[PDB]
Amino acid sequence: AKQKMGRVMQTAAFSLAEVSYATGENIGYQVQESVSTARFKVRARQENVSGVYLSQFESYIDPEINDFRLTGLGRGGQQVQRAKEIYSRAVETLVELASLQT
Amino acid sequence: AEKRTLIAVIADEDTTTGLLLAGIGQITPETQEKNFFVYQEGKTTKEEITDKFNHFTEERDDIAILLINQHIAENIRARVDSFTNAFPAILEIPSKDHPYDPEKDSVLKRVRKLF
Amino acid sequence: EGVYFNIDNGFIEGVVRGYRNGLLSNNQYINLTQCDTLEDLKLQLSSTDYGNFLSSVSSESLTTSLIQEYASSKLYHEFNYIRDQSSGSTRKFMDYITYGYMIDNVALMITGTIHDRDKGEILQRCHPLGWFDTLPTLSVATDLESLYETVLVDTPLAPYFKNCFDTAEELDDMNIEIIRNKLYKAYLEDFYNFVTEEIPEPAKECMQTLLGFEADRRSINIALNSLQSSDIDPDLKSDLLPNIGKLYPLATFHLAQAQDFEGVRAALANVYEYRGFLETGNLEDHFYQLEMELCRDAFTQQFAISTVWAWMKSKEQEVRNITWIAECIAQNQRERINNYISVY
């Protein structure tokens, strides 16, 4: 899965990159300040495989808010809504790789 | 520990913006510290990377998983290899503007022996 | 009759028409798409009037971001050269074109109050069109209230203020979005008023119609996306909407007073000119496709500034297609080769 993820993450990065200039303006400057709520946090899951402790990671997905008041300006609100869920899936997929490394 | 909740990101803006868009991060006004140290190409040195790595790992108990670009880790590759603990779950994330190689991983180095 | 036009604005028409003749049709685009490596794309481009200034300049470090930066630089140089051979009325008109740009530039400067992003680096990525040399933002108190009057005096955007004094002390996401909304509304309204009273006859209709189309697509985007990641009262929905859409003065209220997805579908589907929330691939791609049919029609007259206004966006669309191809080439995900529009 290492290389599979190394490539799908680049695919998602490309998917958003082609989106970032559809509105023809910077989005990062507003993004890095707007984000003030967290949803894709993690929880310590326990599973004694063979009588041995293993604190695994559960993808604590909270799909109710990710960043407030960053869409509807009139040129790019819809476009960012497109590739965002790609990252929402990619991060959940990436949680499991670390869960396995631990 | 149950404090292993927050996620650390040391990556270029093209990835950090999207990561925060997915809702992984936030602003921590209690220290005015972001969940990440933004990276600027050709403007950020290597000592900053080491300092933020140490701050996220051995100074912050919040971080559970760390995402770092391959090129950024290259600046602290020796530091990353030297440090090997299960708590931070260090992960060399693929980097935008660079086709990531899934073989530069410090973690995968131990996988490369005793198949 | 247009006879008086060529008393001060002949070479303006000449240069704009020549640059329009410099447009690259789909025949060159298909050849450029076949290229795989960045060097192949750049050398294919070098065989066109669009190139010879992007390739043979770098050290084979061609990236999509750098491609966009260099490609847009020559368009900026062309615009600034025409500025260098401008005229009285033409100069008094170009400020209107640049207003929509330093609107966002000063919005970014205001946002950079607690982060302190330098003016130079902002210019390295923002729109230089809006830049005016008398913009000392990160040299005095960058507080939006303190800097309010400094900006008010720096550039004459004061008349574009629709009660901008109160609710201008937040430094928050809502404030930064509403300021841009109000600024666009006031700017487009005042521009429409200006052209409707002071402009030669041939532009009178083209400018107003194209402004109406752009204002409509701008008004819809603040209603469709008002139910995607945030919510607001209908009063502000009406406030941020332009007073006159120039294509529909009745359906704007229908959009404003509605708060659900299908309370706005009829407002857009009634006009029977654009499908209601359909024929949507990349929404802005379809917007460009629809707008460029009119922009081409604007290139048929030879006695109005419509030529300049359409060519400004024609070159930007050239850059848009270049970026659409460079994204899939450099990132090596061949899925945008067919995602480009060329009607010239």
XYZ file of C-alpha atoms in Angstrom:
561
model
C 0.000 0.000 0.000
C 2.934 2.406 0.415
C 3.344 3.142 -3.302
C -0.391 2.932 -3.983
C -0.850 5.793 -1.544
C 2.214 7.644 -2.809
C 0.444 7.785 -6.170
C -3.193 8.333 -5.148
C -2.158 11.269 -2.956
C -0.464 12.854 -5.973
C -3.624 12.176 -7.980
C -5.703 14.043 -5.389
C -3.139 16.854 -5.289
C -3.467 17.174 -9.062
C -7.264 17.117 -8.757
C -7.189 20.099 -6.404
C -4.410 21.892 -8.305
C -6.561 22.114 -11.442
C -9.294 23.538 -9.172
C -7.230 26.178 -7.384
C -7.157 28.521 -10.407
C -10.651 27.933 -11.798
C -11.671 30.922 -9.668
C -8.476 32.651 -10.823
C -7.263 33.774 -7.401
C -5.307 32.656 -4.361
C -7.165 30.458 -1.880
C -4.365 29.451 0.476
C -4.002 32.777 2.280
C -7.640 32.691 3.379
C -7.502 28.939 4.025
C -4.589 29.007 6.470
C -6.484 31.476 8.698
C -10.081 30.333 8.196
C -9.439 26.801 9.466
C -10.340 26.834 13.160
C -12.320 23.583 13.610
C -10.970 20.037 13.355
C -12.893 16.982 12.153
C -10.375 14.382 10.915
C -8.865 13.718 14.320
C -7.945 10.277 15.654
C -8.800 7.990 18.560
C -6.748 5.288 20.275
C -8.294 1.926 19.380
C -7.220 -1.136 21.367
C -6.803 -4.639 19.941
C -4.835 -7.358 21.756
C -3.952 -9.481 18.732
C -2.084 -12.192 20.676
C -2.201 -10.906 24.232
C -0.130 -7.878 23.193
C -1.384 -4.306 23.480
C -1.772 -2.400 20.198
C -3.090 1.174 20.324
C -4.540 1.473 16.824
C -5.953 4.585 15.146
C -9.648 5.049 14.397
C -10.398 7.687 11.775
C -12.598 9.984 13.853
C -14.438 11.463 10.872
C -16.674 14.415 11.779
C -18.377 15.433 8.500
C -20.316 18.397 9.884
C -17.725 21.162 9.489
C -14.188 21.535 8.138
C -13.809 25.303 7.657
C -16.442 27.994 8.138
C -17.190 30.942 5.845
C -14.893 30.237 2.912
C -17.419 29.639 0.094
C -20.006 31.782 -1.639
C -17.746 34.741 -2.390
C -19.120 34.438 -5.932
C -16.337 32.931 -8.072
C -14.805 29.911 -6.347
C -17.140 28.545 -3.689
C -18.393 25.680 -5.852
C -14.968 24.786 -7.247
C -13.355 24.191 -3.846
C -16.318 21.995 -2.856
C -15.343 19.574 -5.644
C -11.831 18.334 -4.799
C -12.207 18.823 -1.030
C -13.943 15.476 -0.514
C -11.082 13.827 -2.404
C -8.802 14.917 0.435
C -11.461 13.959 2.976
C -11.158 10.403 1.647
C -7.376 10.538 1.215
C -6.735 11.528 4.838
C -8.947 8.704 6.106
C -6.990 6.315 3.891
C -3.699 7.749 5.194
C -4.729 7.210 8.816
C -4.560 3.445 8.312
C -0.982 3.491 7.010
C 0.197 5.042 10.281
C -2.069 2.655 12.181
C -0.152 -0.191 10.520
C 3.287 1.373 11.059
C 2.650 1.633 14.801
C -2.143 8.098 25.205
C -5.545 9.594 24.428
C -3.886 12.971 23.794
C -2.716 11.502 20.458
C -5.445 13.408 18.620
C -3.944 16.338 16.709
C -2.154 15.892 13.383
C 1.143 17.536 12.427
C 1.894 18.780 8.909
C 5.218 20.104 7.620
C 4.560 20.447 3.900
C 4.309 22.922 1.048
C 1.315 25.244 0.876
C -0.193 23.428 -2.111
C -0.817 20.459 0.202
C -1.317 22.286 3.508
C -4.175 24.386 2.142
C -6.023 21.297 0.961
C -5.332 19.390 4.166
C -6.827 22.196 6.246
C -9.675 22.318 3.721
C -10.447 18.679 4.517
C -10.834 19.825 8.128
C -7.853 18.079 9.720
C -6.412 21.202 11.356
C -7.424 24.357 13.217
C -5.941 27.362 15.028
C -4.815 26.883 18.621
C -5.124 30.363 20.192
C -4.036 29.025 23.594
C -0.536 29.151 22.090
C -1.399 30.872 18.784
C 0.113 27.769 17.189
C -1.186 26.223 13.989
C -1.410 22.462 13.584
C 1.375 22.810 11.001
C 4.515 24.729 10.087
C 3.876 26.096 6.603
C 6.697 25.535 4.114
C 7.998 27.964 1.492
C 10.193 26.641 -1.309
C 13.657 28.171 -1.434
C 12.851 30.429 1.526
C 12.786 28.079 4.535
C 16.061 26.668 5.857
C 16.720 23.271 7.465
C 17.190 24.273 11.115
C 13.554 25.409 11.211
C 12.491 21.940 10.065
C 14.506 20.295 12.845
C 13.188 22.699 15.479
C 9.567 22.147 14.452
C 10.094 18.381 14.279
C 11.404 18.401 17.846
C 8.607 20.727 18.971
C 5.897 18.524 17.466
C 7.385 15.243 18.694
C 9.024 15.779 22.089
C 7.332 19.051 23.129
C 3.723 18.504 21.971
C 1.761 15.495 23.209
C -1.149 16.478 20.951
C 0.348 15.238 17.679
C -0.481 11.633 16.804
C 0.573 11.588 13.133
C 3.138 13.779 11.374
C 3.068 14.471 7.638
C 6.274 15.777 6.061
C 7.289 16.212 2.441
C 10.086 14.043 1.100
C 12.191 17.097 0.253
C 11.513 18.716 3.632
C 12.475 15.471 5.372
C 15.619 15.446 3.225
C 16.686 18.517 5.205
C 16.206 16.572 8.458
C 16.583 13.083 6.990
C 19.332 12.295 9.500
C 17.169 13.626 12.334
C 14.191 11.579 11.135
C 16.250 8.388 10.848
C 17.852 8.896 14.263
C 14.466 9.395 15.955
C 12.299 6.249 15.903
C 9.410 6.192 18.381
C 5.864 4.893 18.063
C 4.176 7.929 19.635
C 4.361 10.517 16.799
C 3.738 8.045 13.943
C 6.076 9.910 11.613
C 4.962 9.597 7.985
C 6.797 10.964 4.935
C 3.787 12.322 3.037
C 3.993 12.705 -0.760
C 4.922 16.250 -1.720
C 3.257 18.480 -4.284
C 5.459 19.879 -7.077
C 7.500 16.649 -6.762
C 6.544 13.127 -7.894
C 6.958 11.392 -4.553
C 9.125 8.287 -4.371
C 7.661 5.612 -2.061
C 11.182 4.405 -1.279
C 12.790 7.341 0.591
C 10.819 6.495 3.736
C 12.818 6.343 6.954
C 10.209 3.943 8.336
C 10.510 1.740 5.251
C 14.267 1.482 5.844
C 13.642 -1.119 8.547
C 11.135 -2.798 6.232
C 13.957 -3.077 3.684
C 15.728 -5.652 5.893
C 14.488 -9.114 6.896
C 11.739 -9.628 4.343
C -21.440 56.604 -37.042
C -17.945 55.837 -35.766
C -16.287 58.420 -38.016
C -14.933 60.374 -35.029
C -13.328 57.296 -33.459
C -10.004 57.471 -35.321
C -9.051 60.907 -34.039
C -7.085 59.648 -31.014
C -7.457 55.832 -30.896
C -6.226 54.380 -34.179
C -3.146 52.500 -33.009
C -5.142 51.176 -30.060
C -7.367 49.385 -32.565
C -4.354 48.391 -34.648
C -2.404 46.800 -31.807
C -5.423 45.092 -30.254
C -6.433 43.655 -33.632
C -2.886 42.455 -34.284
C -2.719 40.746 -30.903
C -6.121 39.174 -31.588
C -4.696 37.893 -34.870
C -1.951 36.458 -32.667
C -4.469 34.158 -30.974
C -3.720 30.440 -31.246
C -6.542 28.266 -32.576
C -7.313 24.675 -31.578
C -4.988 23.486 -34.357
C -1.957 24.571 -32.332
C -3.561 23.383 -29.084
C -3.952 19.809 -30.322
C -0.277 19.698 -31.321
C 0.717 21.147 -27.945
C -1.365 18.496 -26.162
C 0.530 15.659 -27.859
C 3.759 16.862 -26.230
C 4.654 14.855 -23.126
C 7.751 16.441 -21.553
C 7.931 20.053 -20.425
C 10.712 20.674 -22.948
C 8.550 19.242 -25.735
C 5.671 21.545 -24.805
C 7.923 24.600 -24.551
C 9.642 23.935 -27.884
C 6.277 23.351 -29.565
C 5.122 26.682 -28.129
C 8.308 28.395 -29.336
C 7.062 27.846 -32.906
C 4.226 30.305 -32.164
C 3.974 34.035 -31.545
C 2.821 33.057 -28.046
C 6.289 31.633 -27.331
C 9.909 32.604 -27.977
C 9.821 34.388 -24.603
C 8.949 31.530 -22.211
C 11.246 28.814 -23.557
C 14.991 29.401 -23.904
C 14.705 31.547 -20.752
C 14.684 29.072 -17.856
C 17.093 26.209 -17.110
C 14.591 23.426 -17.878
C 12.858 23.896 -14.528
C 9.472 24.362 -16.191
C 6.657 23.883 -13.678
C 2.943 24.539 -14.017
C 3.097 27.442 -11.558
C 6.115 28.922 -13.337
C 4.398 28.290 -16.676
C 1.408 30.314 -15.489
C 3.645 33.067 -14.109
C 5.668 33.483 -17.308
C 2.687 33.095 -19.648
C 0.733 35.862 -17.908
C 3.780 38.146 -17.724
C 3.746 38.911 -21.454
C 0.032 39.752 -21.348
C 0.770 42.180 -18.515
C 3.598 43.668 -20.586
C 1.251 44.136 -23.549
C -1.339 45.834 -21.343
C 1.287 48.102 -19.785
C 2.701 49.005 -23.201
C -0.757 50.004 -24.412
C -0.910 52.039 -21.211
C 2.388 53.561 -22.381
C 0.610 54.714 -25.573
C -2.705 55.515 -23.913
C -5.095 58.455 -24.285
C -7.039 60.734 -21.971
C -10.394 58.968 -22.034
C -8.662 55.614 -22.491
C -6.579 56.228 -19.368
C -9.646 57.356 -17.424
C -11.238 54.069 -18.540
C -8.360 51.720 -17.645
C -8.740 52.581 -13.953
C -12.135 50.891 -14.108
C -10.521 47.723 -15.454
C -7.969 47.813 -12.624
C -10.613 48.495 -9.945
C -11.826 44.900 -9.905
C -8.205 43.904 -9.307
C -7.004 46.144 -6.523
C -10.328 45.408 -4.821
C -8.986 41.921 -4.128
C -5.454 43.262 -3.672
C -6.518 45.544 -0.804
C -8.747 42.768 0.552
C -5.622 40.601 0.788
C -3.732 43.475 2.407
C -6.502 43.847 5.003
C -6.436 40.103 5.658
C -2.679 40.413 6.166
C -3.127 42.424 9.360
C -2.413 39.653 11.890
C -0.238 37.524 9.567
C 1.853 40.348 8.056
C 2.463 38.959 4.576
C 4.760 41.440 2.860
C 3.566 43.581 -0.030
C 6.277 42.301 -2.361
C 5.536 38.619 -1.815
C 1.809 39.318 -2.150
C 2.614 40.924 -5.502
C 4.628 37.819 -6.422
C 1.318 35.898 -6.422
C -1.609 38.356 -6.375
C -2.779 40.470 -9.298
C -0.250 43.229 -10.122
C -2.935 44.905 -12.249
C -4.411 46.368 -9.078
C -1.069 47.462 -7.655
C -0.632 51.196 -7.155
C 2.741 52.443 -5.962
C 1.133 54.519 -3.179
C 0.052 51.507 -1.092
C 1.962 51.592 2.231
C 0.055 48.781 3.931
C 2.752 46.975 5.938
C 4.517 50.178 6.956
C 1.928 51.759 9.291
C -0.668 50.190 11.582
C -2.186 47.434 9.456
C -5.334 47.465 11.606
C -8.288 47.544 9.229
C -9.891 50.436 11.128
C -6.698 52.506 11.220
C -5.839 51.561 7.631
C -9.427 52.246 6.526
C -8.834 55.966 5.989
C -5.294 55.402 4.709
C -6.686 53.249 1.900
C -9.624 55.641 1.474
C -7.144 58.418 0.640
C -4.551 56.266 -1.138
C -6.851 55.345 -4.043
C -10.266 56.892 -4.810
C -12.326 53.821 -3.943
C -14.282 55.806 -1.345
C -17.389 56.232 -3.568
C -17.559 52.431 -3.857
C -18.391 52.268 -0.126
C -21.942 51.135 0.670
C -21.958 51.867 4.404
C -18.512 50.354 4.910
C -17.745 52.162 8.184
C -19.508 49.885 10.666
C -18.965 46.119 10.652
C -15.463 46.822 9.314
C -13.563 45.974 12.507
C -13.722 42.156 12.626
C -10.642 40.760 10.831
C -12.717 37.603 10.341
C -13.733 35.342 7.467
C -17.254 36.779 7.290
C -15.898 40.329 7.128
C -13.351 39.546 4.410
C -15.970 37.796 2.277
C -18.654 40.473 2.662
C -16.202 43.276 1.866
C -15.347 41.604 -1.443
C -19.035 40.996 -2.156
C -19.961 44.638 -1.537
C -16.919 45.918 -3.431
C -17.764 43.878 -6.526
C -21.408 44.947 -6.318
C -20.602 48.656 -6.068
C -17.831 48.490 -8.673
C -19.939 46.733 -11.301
C -22.906 49.011 -10.596
C -20.834 52.177 -10.980
C -19.100 50.854 -14.098
C -22.461 50.056 -15.680
C -23.663 53.555 -14.817
C -20.525 55.100 -16.322
C -20.632 53.202 -19.612
C -24.373 53.846 -19.976
C -23.741 57.613 -20.044
C -20.142 58.202 -21.208
C -18.915 55.890 -23.974
C -19.132 55.843 -27.797
C -22.292 54.394 -29.298
C -20.920 51.051 -30.608
C -19.755 50.032 -27.115
C -22.996 51.168 -25.450
C -24.771 47.846 -26.058
C -21.846 45.409 -26.004
C -20.476 46.693 -22.695
C -23.849 46.683 -20.951
C -24.784 43.215 -22.232
C -21.432 41.661 -21.310
C -21.509 43.364 -17.907
C -24.991 41.965 -17.372
C -23.840 38.456 -18.244
C -20.857 38.691 -15.895
C -22.982 40.178 -13.105
C -25.532 37.386 -13.528
C -22.922 34.638 -13.294
C -21.466 36.489 -10.298
C -24.841 36.787 -8.548
C -25.708 33.117 -9.054
C -22.389 31.955 -7.591
C -23.208 33.722 -4.295
C -26.592 31.951 -4.076
C -25.716 28.417 -5.184
C -22.661 28.417 -2.904
C -24.546 30.065 -0.022
C -25.909 26.592 0.842
C -22.676 24.583 0.434
C -20.567 25.340 3.530
C -22.265 28.252 5.346
C -25.581 30.021 5.901
C -26.765 33.626 6.156
C -30.027 35.540 6.439
C -31.878 36.505 3.230
C -31.391 40.199 4.036
C -27.656 39.906 3.405
C -28.427 37.713 0.389
C -30.324 40.640 -1.124
C -27.701 43.146 0.040
C -24.753 41.387 -1.604
C -26.725 40.767 -4.794
C -26.348 43.513 -7.422
C -29.193 46.002 -7.568
C -29.712 45.331 -11.292
C -28.624 42.119 -12.982
C -29.126 43.711 -16.412
C -30.698 40.455 -17.620
C -33.322 39.876 -14.920
C -34.505 42.363 -12.257
C -37.232 40.073 -10.859
C -35.557 36.677 -10.373
C -32.840 38.229 -8.190
C -35.373 38.604 -5.372
C -36.557 35.055 -6.063
C -32.978 33.917 -5.458
C -32.568 36.110 -2.372
C -35.806 35.186 -0.598
C -35.164 31.464 -1.202
C -32.851 29.424 1.024
C -33.146 25.920 -0.496
C -31.714 24.316 -3.614
C -34.998 24.266 -5.555
C -36.118 27.728 -4.475
C -33.484 29.028 -6.891
C -33.761 26.496 -9.738
C -36.801 28.229 -11.239
C -35.221 31.678 -10.882
C -32.449 30.592 -13.276
C -34.382 28.154 -15.486
C -37.147 30.630 -16.395
C -34.990 32.795 -18.673
C -34.542 29.785 -21.000
C -31.002 30.811 -21.926
C -28.895 28.751 -19.501
C -29.944 25.392 -18.093
C -30.924 25.405 -14.436
C -28.107 23.883 -12.380
C -27.352 21.533 -15.281
C -24.831 21.160 -18.130
C -22.329 21.500 -15.288
C -18.895 19.971 -15.702
C -16.382 22.450 -14.388
C -18.854 25.260 -13.754
C -16.359 28.011 -14.563
C -15.279 26.099 -17.676
C -18.858 26.233 -18.954
C -19.049 29.900 -17.948
C -15.939 30.571 -20.034
C -17.384 28.596 -22.945
C -20.629 30.585 -22.892
C -18.909 33.949 -22.396
C -16.371 33.448 -25.174
C -19.106 33.155 -27.801
C -20.098 36.726 -26.923
C -16.474 37.853 -26.604
C -15.853 36.662 -30.162
C -18.908 38.619 -31.301
C -17.327 41.691 -29.704
C -14.316 41.234 -32.017
C -16.492 42.043 -35.057
C -16.640 45.840 -34.677
C -13.690 48.166 -35.274
C -14.886 51.360 -33.553
C -15.368 50.509 -29.853
C -13.345 49.571 -26.785
C -15.211 46.254 -26.903
C -12.183 44.941 -28.794
C -9.839 45.763 -25.905
C -12.258 44.470 -23.277
C -12.725 41.158 -25.097
C -9.003 40.739 -25.833
C -8.072 41.223 -22.169
C -10.120 38.108 -21.410
C -9.075 36.328 -24.618
C -5.432 36.349 -23.536
C -6.410 35.292 -20.015
C -8.299 32.343 -21.522
C -5.209 31.516 -23.573
C -3.316 31.353 -20.277
C -6.169 29.310 -18.785
C -5.857 26.679 -21.515
C -2.063 26.690 -21.207
C -2.425 26.012 -17.479
C -5.087 23.353 -18.094
C -2.620 21.454 -20.296
C 0.427 22.103 -18.110
C -1.384 20.765 -15.042
C -1.948 17.368 -16.662
C 1.489 17.282 -18.319
C 3.759 18.300 -15.433
C 1.708 16.374 -12.863
C 1.499 13.493 -15.372
C -2.247 12.826 -15.046
C -3.510 12.934 -18.641
C -7.156 13.762 -17.992
C -7.398 17.489 -18.875
C -6.147 17.287 -22.476
C -9.732 17.579 -23.734
C -10.622 20.228 -21.108
C -9.855 23.407 -23.031
C -11.917 25.894 -25.037
C -10.731 27.690 -28.175
C -13.076 29.675 -30.428
C -10.477 31.861 -32.141
